[PDB]
Amino acid sequence: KIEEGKLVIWINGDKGYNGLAEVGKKFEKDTGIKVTVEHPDKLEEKFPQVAATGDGPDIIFWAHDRFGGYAQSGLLAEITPAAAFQDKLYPFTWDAVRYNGKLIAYPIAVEALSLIYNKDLLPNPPKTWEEIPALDKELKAKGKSALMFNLQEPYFTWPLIAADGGYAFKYAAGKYDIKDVGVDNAGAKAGLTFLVDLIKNKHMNADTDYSIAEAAFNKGETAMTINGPWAWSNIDTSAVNYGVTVLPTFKGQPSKPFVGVLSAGINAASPNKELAKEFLENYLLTDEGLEAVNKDKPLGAVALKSYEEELAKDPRIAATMENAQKGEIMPNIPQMSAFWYAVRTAVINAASGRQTVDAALAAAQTNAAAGGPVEILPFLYLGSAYHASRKDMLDALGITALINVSANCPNHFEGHYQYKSIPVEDNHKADISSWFNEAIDFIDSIKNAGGRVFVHSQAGISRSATICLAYLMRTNRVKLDEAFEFVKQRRSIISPNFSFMGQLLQFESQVLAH
């Protein structure tokens, strides 16, 4: 869809959508172009889904890190600002939205996490992470706690993971090196270990999310939080006397927060690209437009040069910029998506005791630098014998059962999962179709118990793909070509051998007998 003559805009629920909506009604007042600002849930996930099929907003707002992958998938329109426009914003904020040398979004404002603290509860914030257990013990005796922050989003734990040496993708020369990932190095392990100790010793609760941590701080229950400039408005409205300061050090090194550039891309499918350009360039990216958003929820340090006067006259912006410089600005490469999903899983699982730090981080390193079991359905995964040997990678996903589709691959962890053997070779003589019904019943029974099956073969290319297609075709009554494109979209190297294709083709005829 996406209607001509209107603008729809998506922005995250923590940003100043009301103040953006006010810029939008200025636009409407002047142009008669209705502007609808929306803040959908899981916006960063939801946008590629809708935009893939030509739907979605006209303009999408997110930090720059997701935008390279949006562009790579053909979801974004190149932006072509005049040189006189490009000069109104800091050169480096343009760099953050530049992907293969094309400008793919408008930068708006620079974001970094800071340590926020209640000045009444804690006149002097700690300089180190190592101090925080002792403060929490003092504070707990008065019925408060030292620190609460969102443990469900890895962005909030990253400054500590990276302080001693963690990193996403190493920056070599002038390219990012997508095989050089620093998620399971000695630094990352040290940082995550410290966070896990905080929890196991009951200084934090692993269930804390954004809203719990904001409520606790803004009601005076907790002495410190970790959050960005958008959060300051709700503290103001509260009765809390707060400061924004340098994040504490860890092992004597500063916390290294990922620095995000809030950005606005134009949907490639929008028929209103010029309207979006006019709204963004001459209504939002002006001192008056940025001020309407900023009054609702602070943007941080806005990309707009003309604001270095007004900004930096705020100590909380100064604090943001100090944490920003101690950090690294996020890469925008298409792999950021898999990286974040991998670190999110590691953090939640280590924080919950479902995985040790070493198992959690190792699993995330492989998934980020190289890949892992591919989700087909929520209870059904597809992969290789290499994966079947990485217990950390099965556990990370919550695997409860495996279908080993091979004649020579051992069942490595028979203690810990339910195993179904299909002992066929990947050649023109194997009758894998003899096992389709057996395997579907196994999958179904494991699913009906809420578990997850990992189907693998030697390569994850032919034998296990063939089993996974047979499940889709019978379970949802779809043809082979439909099932094949669904899986191929998720695991691009699948290639059943010609005899397996025919056996699936014959199985198609039996399952859709009209």
Add this chain to the structure above:
Amino acid sequence: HHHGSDLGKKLLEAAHAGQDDEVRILMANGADVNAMDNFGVTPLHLAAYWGHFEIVEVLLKYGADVNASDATGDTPLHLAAKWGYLGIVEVLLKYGADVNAQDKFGKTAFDISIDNGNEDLAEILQKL
């Protein structure tokens, strides 16, 4: 077995909170004195870490594993040495706490106490 799990969780929370009478009641009703959470932390771990002397002593009378290692390598004596709990460390030792047990950083209770300025505790531990 489901009821025993409930008792255990309350026991961990009571040992953590320093609720002496609650811990006794749960002991009387049959709580696993070595109940664990998903980090392998015991009620003895929590009582030692949080300075609940009376609770420490009840758990040990009831047969708590004095050298229990949580999923992370910490023993109750490591946790008590962290804060210089002379009284708690004394009974843990009385009950056979292992002065040579190492934590995830390779440090013993003596190392932990020196690293935190608990030097009174360190003179005690040094002779063992």
